[PDB]
Protein backbone atom coordinates (compact mmCIF):
# COMPACT_ATOMS: atom_id res chain seq x y z
CA UNK A 1 0.00 0.00 0.00
CA UNK A 2 1.36 3.40 -1.07
CA UNK A 3 0.44 4.99 2.26
CA UNK A 4 3.68 6.98 2.48
CA UNK A 5 2.25 10.42 1.65
CA UNK A 6 -0.59 10.18 4.18
CA UNK A 7 1.98 9.15 6.82
CA UNK A 8 4.91 11.43 5.93
CA UNK A 9 3.35 14.72 4.82
CA UNK A 10 1.89 15.64 8.21
CA UNK A 11 5.08 14.52 9.96
CA UNK A 12 7.20 16.67 7.64
CA UNK A 13 5.06 19.77 8.16
CA UNK A 14 4.90 19.32 11.94
CA UNK A 15 8.66 18.73 12.15
CA UNK A 16 9.14 21.92 10.14
CA UNK A 17 6.92 23.94 12.47
CA UNK A 18 8.62 22.45 15.56
CA UNK A 19 12.03 23.36 14.12
CA UNK A 20 10.74 26.89 13.52
CA UNK A 21 9.49 27.03 17.12
CA UNK A 22 12.86 25.80 18.43
CA UNK A 23 14.65 28.43 16.33
CA UNK A 24 12.31 31.08 17.75
CA UNK A 25 13.00 29.79 21.27
CA UNK A 26 16.73 30.16 20.57
CA UNK A 27 15.99 33.70 19.35
CA UNK A 28 14.13 34.37 22.61
CA UNK A 29 17.10 33.06 24.59
CA UNK A 30 19.44 35.35 22.65
CA UNK A 31 17.05 38.28 23.14
CA UNK A 32 16.85 37.80 26.91
CA UNK A 33 20.65 37.58 26.82
CA UNK A 34 20.93 41.01 25.24
CA UNK A 35 17.52 42.76 25.23
CA UNK A 36 16.17 43.54 28.72
CA UNK A 37 19.13 41.58 30.11
CA UNK A 38 18.54 43.41 33.39
CA UNK A 39 19.39 41.15 36.32
CA UNK A 40 16.88 42.64 38.77
CA UNK A 41 13.55 41.75 37.07
CA UNK A 42 12.77 39.42 34.13
CA UNK A 43 9.35 37.71 33.71
CA UNK A 44 10.10 34.17 32.53
CA UNK A 45 7.41 31.54 32.09
CA UNK A 46 7.35 27.83 32.95
CA UNK A 47 4.15 26.43 31.51
CA UNK A 48 1.40 28.57 33.06
CA UNK A 49 3.43 30.73 35.44
CA UNK A 50 5.63 33.81 35.24
CA UNK A 51 8.47 34.26 37.70
CA UNK A 52 10.23 37.55 37.19
CA UNK A 53 13.31 36.34 39.03
CA UNK A 54 15.34 34.23 36.59
CA UNK A 55 18.18 35.82 34.63
CA UNK A 56 20.79 33.05 34.67
CA UNK A 57 18.17 30.63 36.00
CA UNK A 58 16.35 30.95 32.66
CA UNK A 59 18.71 28.42 31.08
CA UNK A 60 17.44 25.82 33.58
CA UNK A 61 14.41 25.47 31.29
CA UNK A 62 15.92 26.99 28.14
CA UNK A 63 18.21 23.97 27.80
CA UNK A 64 15.37 21.68 28.90
CA UNK A 65 13.07 22.93 26.14
CA UNK A 66 15.96 22.98 23.65
CA UNK A 67 16.82 19.31 24.12
CA UNK A 68 13.25 18.08 24.69
CA UNK A 69 12.40 19.66 21.35
CA UNK A 70 15.48 18.82 19.27
CA UNK A 71 16.03 15.21 20.39
CA UNK A 72 12.36 14.27 20.04
CA UNK A 73 11.96 16.05 16.70
CA UNK A 74 15.04 14.62 15.00
CA UNK A 75 14.19 11.19 16.44
CA UNK A 76 10.74 11.55 14.87
CA UNK A 77 12.40 12.82 11.68
CA UNK A 78 14.28 9.53 11.66
CA UNK A 79 10.91 7.86 12.30
CA UNK A 80 9.28 9.52 9.28
CA UNK A 81 12.35 8.66 7.20
CA UNK A 82 11.85 5.08 8.40
CA UNK A 83 8.22 5.26 7.26
CA UNK A 84 9.56 6.44 3.90
CA UNK A 85 12.19 3.70 3.55
CA UNK A 86 9.96 0.82 4.69
CA UNK A 87 7.80 1.46 1.62
CA UNK A 88 10.76 2.39 -0.61
CA UNK B 1 -35.85 31.40 -18.16
CA UNK B 2 -37.20 29.63 -15.08
CA UNK B 3 -35.14 26.37 -15.21
CA UNK B 4 -31.70 28.02 -15.29
CA UNK B 5 -32.70 30.44 -12.53
CA UNK B 6 -33.93 27.54 -10.40
CA UNK B 7 -30.68 25.65 -11.06
CA UNK B 8 -28.54 28.61 -9.98
CA UNK B 9 -30.81 29.11 -6.95
CA UNK B 10 -29.07 26.07 -5.44
CA UNK B 11 -25.74 27.92 -5.56
CA UNK B 12 -27.50 31.00 -4.17
CA UNK B 13 -28.84 28.85 -1.33
CA UNK B 14 -25.39 27.42 -0.60
CA UNK B 15 -23.79 30.86 -0.38
CA UNK B 16 -26.62 32.08 1.85
CA UNK B 17 -26.08 29.02 4.04
CA UNK B 18 -22.37 29.83 4.21
CA UNK B 19 -23.22 33.35 5.39
CA UNK B 20 -25.72 31.86 7.86
CA UNK B 21 -22.85 29.77 9.21
CA UNK B 22 -20.98 33.08 9.37
CA UNK B 23 -23.72 34.61 11.52
CA UNK B 24 -23.72 31.48 13.70
CA UNK B 25 -20.01 32.21 14.05
CA UNK B 26 -21.22 35.68 15.07
CA UNK B 27 -23.33 34.20 17.87
CA UNK B 28 -20.40 32.04 19.01
CA UNK B 29 -17.75 34.80 19.01
CA UNK B 30 -19.28 36.96 21.75
CA UNK B 31 -18.48 34.39 24.46
CA UNK B 32 -14.85 35.20 25.37
CA UNK B 33 -15.76 38.87 25.77
CA UNK B 34 -19.06 38.23 27.58
CA UNK B 35 -17.41 36.19 30.32
CA UNK B 36 -14.68 38.86 30.27
CA UNK B 37 -17.38 41.37 31.24
CA UNK B 38 -18.79 38.90 33.76
CA UNK B 39 -15.29 38.56 35.26
CA UNK B 40 -14.91 42.36 35.51
CA UNK B 41 -16.39 42.29 39.02
CA UNK B 42 -13.67 39.92 40.30
CA UNK B 43 -10.96 42.55 39.69
CA UNK B 44 -12.24 45.29 42.00
CA UNK B 45 -13.44 42.82 44.66
CA UNK B 46 -9.91 41.37 44.97
CA UNK B 47 -7.69 44.46 44.70
CA UNK B 48 -6.34 43.94 48.24
CA UNK B 49 -4.91 40.58 47.16
CA UNK B 50 -7.05 37.51 47.75
CA UNK B 51 -6.99 33.72 47.52
CA UNK B 52 -8.06 32.31 44.14
CA UNK B 53 -8.67 28.84 42.72
CA UNK B 54 -7.93 29.16 39.01
CA UNK B 55 -7.60 26.80 36.02
CA UNK B 56 -4.12 25.97 34.78
CA UNK B 57 -4.85 24.86 31.22
CA UNK B 58 -8.51 23.87 31.35
CA UNK B 59 -8.78 20.84 33.61
CA UNK B 60 -6.51 21.66 36.58
CA UNK B 61 -7.15 23.72 39.71
CA UNK B 62 -4.53 25.01 42.15
CA UNK B 63 -4.95 27.45 45.07
CA UNK B 64 -3.10 30.74 44.85
CA UNK B 65 -3.45 34.35 46.01
CA UNK B 66 -3.60 36.97 43.26
CA UNK B 67 -1.42 40.05 43.75
CA UNK B 68 0.22 42.84 41.75
CA UNK B 69 -2.84 44.34 40.08
CA UNK B 70 -0.45 46.97 38.68
CA UNK B 71 0.85 44.42 36.14
CA UNK B 72 -2.27 42.39 35.33
CA UNK B 73 -1.66 41.30 31.78
CA UNK B 74 -3.43 40.54 28.51
CA UNK B 75 -1.90 38.94 25.43
CA UNK B 76 -2.11 40.68 22.06
CA UNK B 77 -0.76 40.39 18.52
CA UNK B 78 2.38 38.39 17.70
CA UNK B 79 3.59 38.29 21.30
CA UNK B 80 3.12 41.80 22.68
CA UNK B 81 2.44 42.78 26.27
CA UNK B 82 -0.48 44.70 27.83
CA UNK B 83 0.52 45.38 31.46
CA UNK B 84 -2.68 46.52 33.16
CA UNK B 85 -2.00 48.89 36.05
CA UNK B 86 -3.73 48.93 39.42
CA UNK B 87 -6.17 51.80 38.82
CA UNK B 88 -6.83 50.23 35.43
CA UNK B 89 -7.58 46.90 37.14
CA UNK B 90 -10.22 48.67 39.23
CA UNK B 91 -11.92 50.95 36.73
CA UNK B 92 -10.21 51.32 33.33
CA UNK B 93 -10.60 47.79 32.03
CA UNK B 94 -14.28 48.77 31.96
CA UNK B 95 -13.46 51.06 29.03
CA UNK B 96 -11.14 48.37 27.67
CA UNK B 97 -14.20 46.10 27.68
CA UNK B 98 -16.05 48.96 26.00
CA UNK B 99 -13.57 48.86 23.11
CA UNK B 100 -13.56 45.06 22.86
CA UNK B 101 -17.36 45.34 22.82
CA UNK B 102 -16.89 47.95 20.09
CA UNK B 103 -15.19 45.25 18.02
CA UNK B 104 -18.14 43.08 19.01
CA UNK B 105 -20.32 45.75 17.37
CA UNK B 106 -18.11 45.54 14.29
CA UNK B 107 -19.26 41.92 14.48
CA UNK B 108 -23.01 42.19 15.10
CA UNK B 109 -24.25 45.59 13.76
CA UNK B 110 -21.83 46.02 10.84
CA UNK B 111 -22.42 42.45 9.60
CA UNK B 112 -26.14 42.06 10.30
CA UNK B 113 -26.70 45.26 8.32
CA UNK B 114 -25.06 43.68 5.26
CA UNK B 115 -26.85 40.37 5.90
CA UNK B 116 -30.10 42.32 5.63
CA UNK B 117 -29.49 41.93 1.89
CA UNK B 118 -29.00 38.20 2.51
CA UNK B 119 -32.50 37.93 3.98
CA UNK B 120 -33.74 40.17 1.15
CA UNK B 121 -32.27 37.65 -1.30
CA UNK B 122 -34.12 34.89 0.56
CA UNK B 123 -37.37 36.82 0.16
CA UNK B 124 -36.65 37.58 -3.51
CA UNK B 125 -35.89 33.91 -4.27
CA UNK B 126 -39.62 33.13 -4.03
CA UNK B 127 -40.02 34.84 -7.42
Amino acid sequence: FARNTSRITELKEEIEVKKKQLQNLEDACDDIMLADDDCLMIPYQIGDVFISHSQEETQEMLEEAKKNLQEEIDALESRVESIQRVLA
Amino acid sequence: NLPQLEMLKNQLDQEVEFLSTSIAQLKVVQTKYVEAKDCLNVLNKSNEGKELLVPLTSSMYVPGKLHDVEHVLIDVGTGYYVEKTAEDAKDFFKRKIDFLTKQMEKIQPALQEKHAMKQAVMEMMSQ
Binding site: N24, D31, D36, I42, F50 | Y80, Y81, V82, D88, F99
Partner: protein
Amino acid sequence: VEKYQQLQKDLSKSMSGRQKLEAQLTENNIVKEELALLDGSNVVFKLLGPVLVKQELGEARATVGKRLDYITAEIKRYESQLRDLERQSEQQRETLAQLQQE
Protein backbone atom coordinates in the same frame (compact mmCIF):
# COMPACT_ATOMS: atom_id res chain seq x y z
CA VAL C 1 -11.23 23.34 -16.96
CA GLU C 2 -7.66 23.17 -15.68
CA LYS C 3 -6.32 26.74 -15.67
CA TYR C 4 -9.55 28.24 -14.34
CA GLN C 5 -9.63 25.76 -11.46
CA GLN C 6 -5.95 26.33 -10.66
CA LEU C 7 -6.48 30.09 -10.54
CA GLN C 8 -9.60 29.59 -8.41
CA LYS C 9 -7.57 27.55 -5.92
CA ASP C 10 -4.85 30.22 -5.89
CA LEU C 11 -7.53 32.86 -5.26
CA SER C 12 -8.97 30.80 -2.41
CA LYS C 13 -5.72 30.06 -0.58
CA SER C 14 -4.56 33.66 -0.93
CA MET C 15 -7.88 35.13 0.21
CA SER C 16 -8.16 32.84 3.25
CA GLY C 17 -4.88 34.18 4.61
CA ARG C 18 -5.79 37.73 3.62
CA GLN C 19 -9.12 37.46 5.47
CA LYS C 20 -7.57 35.96 8.61
CA LEU C 21 -4.91 38.68 8.70
CA GLU C 22 -7.69 41.24 8.25
CA ALA C 23 -9.60 39.68 11.16
CA GLN C 24 -6.58 40.00 13.46
CA LEU C 25 -5.63 43.42 12.06
CA THR C 26 -9.05 44.95 12.79
CA GLU C 27 -8.27 44.36 16.48
CA ASN C 28 -4.55 45.16 16.50
CA ASN C 29 -5.19 48.53 14.80
CA ILE C 30 -7.27 49.83 17.71
CA VAL C 31 -5.27 48.09 20.45
CA LYS C 32 -2.09 49.75 19.20
CA GLU C 33 -3.78 53.08 18.40
CA GLU C 34 -4.81 53.68 21.99
CA LEU C 35 -1.63 51.91 23.19
CA ALA C 36 0.45 54.65 21.54
CA LEU C 37 -1.25 57.30 23.71
CA LEU C 38 -2.19 55.56 27.00
CA ASP C 39 1.38 55.21 28.34
CA GLY C 40 1.69 54.57 32.06
CA SER C 41 -1.48 52.48 32.20
CA ASN C 42 0.12 50.02 29.76
CA VAL C 43 3.78 49.83 28.74
CA VAL C 44 5.13 48.12 25.63
CA PHE C 45 6.95 44.82 26.15
CA LYS C 46 7.37 41.74 23.97
CA LEU C 47 5.66 38.50 25.06
CA LEU C 48 7.76 36.51 22.59
CA GLY C 49 6.52 33.16 23.83
CA PRO C 50 6.97 32.15 27.48
CA VAL C 51 9.16 35.14 28.36
CA LEU C 52 9.00 38.94 28.60
CA VAL C 53 11.45 41.58 27.35
CA LYS C 54 11.16 45.37 27.45
CA GLN C 55 10.11 46.61 24.01
CA GLU C 56 9.93 49.98 22.28
CA LEU C 57 7.01 51.29 20.22
CA GLY C 58 8.88 52.04 16.99
CA GLU C 59 9.77 48.50 15.95
CA ALA C 60 6.19 47.42 16.66
CA ARG C 61 5.05 50.25 14.38
CA ALA C 62 7.48 49.07 11.69
CA THR C 63 6.18 45.51 12.11
CA VAL C 64 2.53 46.50 11.70
CA GLY C 65 3.37 48.80 8.77
CA LYS C 66 5.19 46.05 6.91
CA ARG C 67 2.28 43.73 7.69
CA LEU C 68 0.11 46.33 5.97
CA ASP C 69 2.39 46.62 2.93
CA TYR C 70 2.70 42.83 2.66
CA ILE C 71 -1.05 42.25 2.83
CA THR C 72 -1.75 44.99 0.27
CA ALA C 73 0.78 43.39 -2.10
CA GLU C 74 -0.98 40.07 -1.53
CA ILE C 75 -4.32 41.76 -2.33
CA LYS C 76 -3.02 42.92 -5.71
CA ARG C 77 -1.58 39.43 -6.26
CA TYR C 78 -5.00 37.89 -5.56
CA GLU C 79 -6.80 40.37 -7.81
CA SER C 80 -4.33 39.73 -10.64
CA GLN C 81 -5.13 36.04 -10.26
CA LEU C 82 -8.78 37.09 -10.49
CA ARG C 83 -8.25 38.72 -13.88
CA ASP C 84 -6.25 35.65 -14.92
CA LEU C 85 -9.19 33.41 -13.98
CA GLU C 86 -11.72 35.55 -15.83
CA ARG C 87 -9.46 35.60 -18.90
CA GLN C 88 -9.10 31.81 -18.90
CA SER C 89 -12.86 31.47 -18.34
CA GLU C 90 -13.43 32.21 -22.04
CA GLN C 91 -10.93 30.10 -23.97
CA GLN C 92 -9.80 27.46 -21.47
CA ARG C 93 -13.52 26.71 -21.05
CA GLU C 94 -14.22 26.76 -24.80
CA THR C 95 -11.47 24.11 -25.07
CA LEU C 96 -13.98 21.35 -24.31
CA ALA C 97 -16.94 23.10 -25.97
CA GLN C 98 -15.22 23.39 -29.36
CA LEU C 99 -14.17 19.73 -29.30
CA GLN C 100 -17.73 18.66 -28.49
CA GLN C 101 -19.09 20.99 -31.18
CA GLU C 102 -16.83 19.76 -34.00
